[PDB]
Design a protein around this ligand. Structure first.
Ligand SMILES: CC1=C[C@H](OC[C@@H]2C(=O)O[C@@H]3c4ccccc4C[C@H]23)OC1=O
Ligand SMILES: [Cl-]
Ligand SMILES: [Cl-]
Length: 268
């Protein structure tokens, strides 16, 4: 019963399956503007990450999900029970990295990864600009732990971006507050604590790096970092738009970019 655990939804028709993973704060409905454009040529599988508001909180193994590997094996188990191989993995934020790690362990399950707002490490290092100094992110988490609803009412507009009181601004706010707070904090400890830079050379399946030109959470430098350190074919396309969830806040300009990168491969 894994399909129930992650609310796996399956539809469309085709020879190769497109898998859709979401990021923190939302769930699979994040892809409302993408699903209809694929179902005429592909099977489409959607799944929620464990911890999302639509999942049973009794299933959030805190020890297992204390690291990205826990979610990576969830994705492998999902793909296995639905008989998915050589899939096209389209992942936003978290799921993109979960997908990338999974493709290292089980390259038989992935043909390519299309990723949006991907981040291999939240904080700045030497040789790496990820947005915020580690010292300061630690305060952003610690204050979120001290006063959860207050500072996430803050956080949510900064992440969605754009005009206040929009569909994406109200949708993300709704799904974000549907998470149980202790689960949300564990997920945040996991994300703010991971560092995938040494893993990137082990990802050798082709990676399409798509990201916003004005994302508070992922600077443009992060995409050129990914493009330079991935172990296989890769490519970068910027989207002239603001926000962390372009696929939801600006579908007219983001969806055709995703489609082209889903449809088309990478030339030598
Ligand atoms: C899955 C995903 C990753 C990327 O966020 C990372 C994180 C998030 O947004 O606040 C989380 C948080 C919590 C405390 C400190 C920093 C961060 C940044 C974290 O954006 C996403 O959707
Ligand atoms: Cl536990
Ligand atoms: Cl186009």
């Amino acid at each position: 019963t894994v399909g129930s655990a992650h609310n796996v939804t399956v539809l469309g028709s085709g020879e190769t399956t497109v898998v859709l993973g979401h990021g923190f704060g939302t769930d699979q409905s994040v892809w409302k503007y993408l699903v209809p454009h694929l179902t005429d040529d592909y099977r489409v599988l959607l799944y929620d990450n464990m911890g999302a508001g639509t999942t049973d909180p009794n299933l959030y193994d805190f020890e297992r999900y204390s690291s990205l590997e826990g979610h990576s094996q969830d994705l492998i188990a999902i793909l296995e029970e639905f008989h998915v191989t050589k899939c096209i993995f389209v992942g936003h934020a978290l799921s993109s990295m979960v997908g990338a790690v999974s493709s290292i362990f089980r390259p038989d399950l992935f043909r390519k990864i299309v990723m949006i707002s991907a981040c291999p490490r939240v904080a700045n290092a030497d040789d790496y600009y990820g947005g915020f100094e580690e010292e300061d992110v630690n305060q952003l988490y610690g204050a979120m732990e001290e006063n959860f609803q207050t500072m996430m009412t803050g956080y949510a507009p900064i992440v969605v971006g754009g005009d206040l009181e929009s569909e994406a601004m109200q949708e993300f706010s709704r799904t974000l507050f549907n998470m149980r707070p202790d689960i949300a904090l564990s997920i945040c400890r996991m994300i703010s604590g991971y560092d995938l830079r040494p893993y990137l050379g082990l990802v050798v399946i082709p990676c399409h790096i798509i990201q916003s030109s004005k994302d508070k959470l992922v600077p443009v430098a992060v995409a050129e970092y990914l493009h330079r350190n991935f172990g296989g074919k890769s490519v970068v396309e910027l989207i002239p738009t603001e926000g962390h969830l372009p696929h939801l806040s600006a579908p007219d300009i983001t969806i055709p970019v995703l489609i082209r990168h889903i449809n088309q491969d990478i030339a030598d």
